Amino acid sequence: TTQSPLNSFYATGTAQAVSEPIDVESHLGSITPAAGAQGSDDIGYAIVWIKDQVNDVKLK
Amino acid sequence: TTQSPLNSFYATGTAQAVSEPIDVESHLGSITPAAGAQGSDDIGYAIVWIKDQVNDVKLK
Numbered sequence: 711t712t713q714s715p716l717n718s719f720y721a722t723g724t725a726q727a728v729s730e731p732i733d734v735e736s737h738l739g740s741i742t743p744a745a746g747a748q749g750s751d752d753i754g755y756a757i758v759w760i761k762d763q764v765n766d767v768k769l770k
Numbered sequence: 771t772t773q774s775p776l777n778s779f780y781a782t783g784t785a786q787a788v789s790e791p792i793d794v795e796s797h798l799g800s801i802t803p804a805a806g807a808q809g810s811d812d813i814g815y816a817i818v819w820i821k822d823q824v825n826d827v828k829l830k
């Protein structure tokens with residue numbers, strides 16, 4: 711009568727990667743010496759947000 | 771996953787040399803003989819301040 715191939719069974723899921731691993735927002739400052747002067751000053755900072763299940767980051 | 775170069779460790783210090791090794795301030799006097807006379811007189815002194823971790827000085 712009917713001979714089934716016994717293959718018509720399926721299960722399906724989805725995957726996505728919609729975000730980059732890091733986000734960088736800058737809060738740097740300024741360097742204001744006189745002409746030819748020597749000095750040092752703190753510039754500011756830069757926030758590096760870490761995204762989903764990211765544990766170690768290697769940057770350049 | 772991530773292969774660290776194991777180089778991103780730093781320690782920093784500063785150095786400066788903002789003063790000259792010696793300071794000289796003068797308290798000399800005057801020589802007041804007559805015309806063609808022969809004599810000798812004390813002139814005065816000159817203070818030679820010695821600066822940070824200076825132990826031996828050679829002057830000209």
Ligand SMILES: [Ca+2]
Pocket residue numbers: 763764765766
């Ligand atoms: Ca992870």
Ligand SMILES: [Ca+2]
Pocket residue numbers: 806807808
């Ligand atoms: Ca004479």
Ligand SMILES: [Ca+2]
Pocket residue numbers: 807808809
């Ligand atoms: Ca004389």
Ligand SMILES: [Ca+2]
Pocket residue numbers: 823824825826
């Ligand atoms: Ca010395």
